[PDB]
Amino acid sequence: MARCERLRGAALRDVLGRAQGVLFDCDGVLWNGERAVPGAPELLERLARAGKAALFVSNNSRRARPELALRFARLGFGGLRAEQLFSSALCAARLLRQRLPGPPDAPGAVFVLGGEGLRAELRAAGLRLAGDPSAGDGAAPRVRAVLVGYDEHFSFAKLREACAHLRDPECLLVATDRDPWHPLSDGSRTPGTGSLAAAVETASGRQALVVGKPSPYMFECITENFSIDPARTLMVGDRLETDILFGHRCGMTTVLTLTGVSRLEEAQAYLAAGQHDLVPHYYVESIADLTEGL
Amino acid sequence: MARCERLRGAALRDVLGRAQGVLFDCDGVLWNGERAVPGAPELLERLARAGKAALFVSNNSRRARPELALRFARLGFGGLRAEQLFSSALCAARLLRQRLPGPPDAPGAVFVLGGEGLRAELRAAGLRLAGDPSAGDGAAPRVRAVLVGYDEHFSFAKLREACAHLRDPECLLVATDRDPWHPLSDGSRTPGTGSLAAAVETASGRQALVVGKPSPYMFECITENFSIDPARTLMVGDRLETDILFGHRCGMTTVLTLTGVSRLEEAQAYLAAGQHDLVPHYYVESIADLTEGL
Ligand SMILES: O=c1cc(-c2ccccc2)oc2c(O)c(O)ccc12
Ligand SMILES: O=c1cc(-c2ccccc2)oc2c(O)c(O)ccc12
Ligand SMILES: [Mg+2]
Ligand SMILES: [Mg+2]
């Protein structure tokens, strides 16, 4: 079982050599804020030269895929295809397209708590949004899902409206992710989707369907058009309760990097408590430590 | 132990006869919205004639005591003294006065998520509020508590500011109550303080000190200036997880009335699960059924 081993030396060469690809979390792993982790671009160049696949998975719903791709480029991660990038905004849009209730001749609408990147992904997946213009008649389409994402304009009034839609038990409640908070450059924090979802769940008495990590649905989304054997995929993340748990639920070897949210002492406390699904198989100080294994 | 018995007949006469007073929840018990429960004013008149004390305890922080007293009068509950009325706004103000950290020569301020009734109670207890004017110097007083109450103007920005104050581990986190939602006249619901507290707790990683029912602190607040033996006090409420649990924690005989939030079938499900602290000793269809026991 996972034992939180510092990955180095021959073990590092063997782990990377057997892996067919690496699935990276983004925030706290490749970068912090607008600062790339030193050595991270060089790791990705060496992985490619070694013929290993690289895929990326983020619970951040700020950027639709085109704006996410440009961010990778800007921070030194060249040569990437947009098809390698998976965010909770993209995967939430796809899940709603796959699962929205209602008849095909009278499609429903999604009431969205979230920002313009998230809304852009929803529309690109064909979803109609509550508040969008009504047809000439004026009869607004029925709301058949509430989607909670990172919403800098969250308000009591929006929370109460979500509850009104959720009075219909057939209306879905979906959340992009459950991350509770995110660190800012000065050591402060900003509230995360999980804090807003907690309010929506508590007021409505409903449990949300979570799209993002640690839900295995995110691995379904990533693998819809790319064949990756989870038994041959390394999952690299900074957050025990999202990235590492995700990896265990999907059957991947997990690596905690220490440049982000979770601390080594937390992983060790989970191991001492026997909570092995929150323990990484391996850790590194930063992902630059992986390059030597190639 | 509590067995959820319908209270009637000789048992009703004995239970009321042995009681020295009755502690009533307000919303869902005395009234629904702006409609008084039929017979409820007459019960309170008969209790007084019988020499039994009546006290009132609400988690609603909309009304400071003067506006709460006028509401009782308007709905037919005459002859009451404001000193009989205890809301989570009043008791939160008193708790903050008793527990606010900081030196006596440089008192702190309270960052409040809540409305004007709540703020009025805080000021009447001597508390200074974040955002109040600064002294001539301009140096704003340090925020030493965050208070979450029912906040119709809750926003992501206010949530993020609360988190900034809570970065100081000595800054208290207090909530007026944890009620998750409240029913409206048309069967919709409005979010409750517990939904907002859930967001604040989740984003900050803190657990709130809850003032209102089911916290026993509310019974400390009620009894500060009135001597009531809990062993001789009947607790009458409509909400299992707040009023009935409160009664059990304080050692009172509990009565569920069915004119409000909780349903008889819920109480029976808790009893079948052995969760006796959420089971009322007795129930009535409405508190008008108690009058015959006098
Ligand atoms: O999902 C989001 C996550 C974050 C985030 C902020 C700091 C560190 C890590 C993640 O910021 C966002 C944001 O600024 C938006 O406008 C919209 C969405 C998000
Ligand atoms: O604490 C409060 C509880 C409620 C409430 C609403 C419906 C049924 C029962 C309780 O409404 C409030 C309100 O409208 C305010 O403006 C301020 C505070 C509250
Ligand atoms: Mg991360
Ligand atoms: Mg009540």
Does any CB of chain A come closer than 8 Å to the CB of residue B151? yes
Alpha-carbon gap, residue A131 to A119, rounded angstroms: 12
Beta-sheet pairing, A31-32 with A35-36: antiparallel
Peptide bond between residue B214 and the one before it cis (omega within 30 degrees of 0): yes
Does any CB of chain A come closer than 8 Å to the CB of residue B169? no
Does B170 share its domain with B219? Answer: no
Surface-to-core class of residue A75, CB atoms within 10 Å of its CB (0-12 exposed, 13-18 middle, 19+ buried): middle
Peptide bond between residue A214 and the one before it cis (omega within 30 degrees of 0): yes
Is B100 in contact with B108 (CB distance < 8 Å)? yes
Looking at B210, B237, B270, which one is the last position of a domain? B210
Alpha-carbon gap, residue B256 to B268, rounded angstroms: 12
C-alpha angle with apex A289: A284 to A291, nearest 5 degrees? 135
Does A204 share its domain with A220? Answer: no
Is A56 in contact with A47 (CB distance < 8 Å)? no
Interface test with A, best of B61, B151, B152, B156 (most A CBs within 10 A): B156
Does any CB of chain A come closer than 8 Å to the CB of residue B275? no
Alpha-carbon gap, residue B11 to A12, rounded angstroms: 76
Does A104 share its domain with A161? Answer: yes
A116 belongs to a structural domain: yes
A65 belongs to a structural domain: no
Does A200 share its domain with A94? Answer: yes
C-alpha angle with apex A224: A148 to A248, nearest 5 degrees? 70
Alpha-carbon gap, residue B80 to B64, rounded angstroms: 15
Ligand 2 pocket list (CB less than 6 A): B 27, 60-62, 115, 150, 152, 182, 190
Query: Which of A60, A71, A118 shows the shortest CA–CA distance to A94?
Result: A118
Helices (H) and strands (E) in chain A, counts: 10, 16
B220 belongs to a structural domain: yes
Which residues make Cβ contacts (< 8 Å) with residue A215, sequence separation at least 6?
A: A246
C-alpha angle with apex B263: A169 to B270, nearest 5 degrees? 95
The residue type at B50? A
Residues pairing with B236 in the sheet: B24, B255
Looking at A182, A210, A238, which one is the last position of a domain? A210
Binding-site residues from annotation of A for Mg(2+): 25, 27, 238
Domain of residue A99 covers 90-210
In the block, residue with structure tokens 């986190």: B173
Beta-sheet pairing, A282-284 with A253-257: parallel
Q: How far is A52 from chain B (nearest CA, A)?
A: 37
Distances, alpha carbon B227 to alpha carbons A27, B53, B78, B150, in Å:
58, 10, 23, 30
Is A208 in contact with A148 (CB distance < 8 Å)? yes
The residue type at A291? T
Looking at A153, A176, A210, which one is the last position of a domain? A210
Does B167 share its domain with B201? Answer: yes
In the block, residue with structure tokens 């983020």: A58
Q: Whose CA is nearest to atom 16 of ligand 1?
A: A62
B195 phi, psi to nearest 5 deg: -70, -40
B82 belongs to a structural domain: no
Query: Which of B231, B233, B239 shows the shortest CA–CA distance to B259?
Result: B239
Beta-sheet pairing, A172-175 with A143-148: parallel
Largest CA distance in chain A: 69
Alpha-carbon gap, residue B21 to B231, rounded angstroms: 10
State yes or no: B134 annotated in a binding site: no
Binding site membership of A60 for ligand 1 (Cβ less than 6 Å): yes
Alpha-carbon gap, residue B247 to B281, rounded angstroms: 10
Pairwise CB contact (< 8 Å): A181 & B198:
no
C-alpha angle with apex B182: B290 to B91, nearest 5 degrees? 75
Does A124 share its domain with A234? Answer: no
Positive/negative CA dihedral, B194, B198, B200, B201? positive
Does A206 share its domain with A222? Answer: no
Alpha-carbon gap, residue B167 to A276, rounded angstroms: 30
Alpha-carbon gap, residue A46 to A73, rounded angstroms: 16
Q: How many domains does chain B have?
A: 2
Residues with CB under 5 A from ligand 3 (ion): A 25, 27-28, 238
Q: Whose CA is nearest to atom 14 of ligand 2?
A: B62
Helix (H, G, I), strand (E, B) or coil at A14: helix
Does A130 share its domain with A206? Answer: yes
The whole-angstrom distance between residue B19's C-alpha and the CA centroid of its chain comes to: 22
Q: How far is B60 from chain A (nearest CA, A)?
A: 16
Residue B42, token pair as written in the block: 């007459």
Which residues make Cβ contacts (< 8 Å) with residue B39, sequence separation at least 6?
A: B286, B287, B288, B291
Does A96 share its domain with A198? Answer: yes
Q: Which residues of B touch A154 (CB under 8 A)?
A: 155-156, 159
Residues pairing with A253 in the sheet: A234
State yes or no: B32 annotated in a binding site: no
Torsion of CA A128, A129, A132, A137, to 10 degrees: 50
In the block, residue with structure tokens 């969205």: A112
Pairwise CB contact (< 8 Å): A198 & B198:
yes
Q: What is the distance between the terminal CA atoms of chain B, rounded to a whole angstrom? A: 25
A11 belongs to a structural domain: yes
Quick one: resolution in A? Answer: 1.5
Does B95 share its domain with B52? Answer: no
Binding-site residues from annotation of A for substrate: 58-60, 182, 213
A71 belongs to a structural domain: no
B272 belongs to a structural domain: yes
A residues 170..189 contacting B (CB < 8 A)? 180-181, 187-189
Residues pairing with A255 in the sheet: A236, A282
A residues 88..127 contacting B (CB < 8 A)? none
Alpha-carbon gap, residue A148 to B198, rounded angstroms: 15
Question: DSSP string covering A32-45, please?
Answer: ETTEEPTTHHHHHH
Q: Looking at residue A290, what DSSP letter applies?
A: G
Does A113 share its domain with A10? Answer: no
Beta-sheet pairing, A85-87 with A53-58: parallel
The residue type at B289? D
Query: Which of A203, A113, A195, A131 shows the shortest CA–CA distance to A160?
Result: A203
Helix (H, G, I), strand (E, B) or coil at B235: strand
Q: How many residues does chain B have?
A: 294
Alpha-carbon gap, residue A197 to B44, rounded angstroms: 42
Q: How many residues does chain A have?
A: 294
Q: Which residues of A touch B241 (CB under 8 A)?
A: none
Does A106 share its domain with A145? Answer: yes
Interface test with A, best of B195, B207, B261 (most A CBs within 10 A): B195
Is A59 in contact with A176 (CB distance < 8 Å)? yes
Residue B97, token pair as written in the block: 């006065």
Is B265 in contact with B283 (CB distance < 8 Å)? no
A274 belongs to a structural domain: yes
Is B239 in contact with B278 (CB distance < 8 Å)? no
At A162, which CATH number? 3.40.50.1000
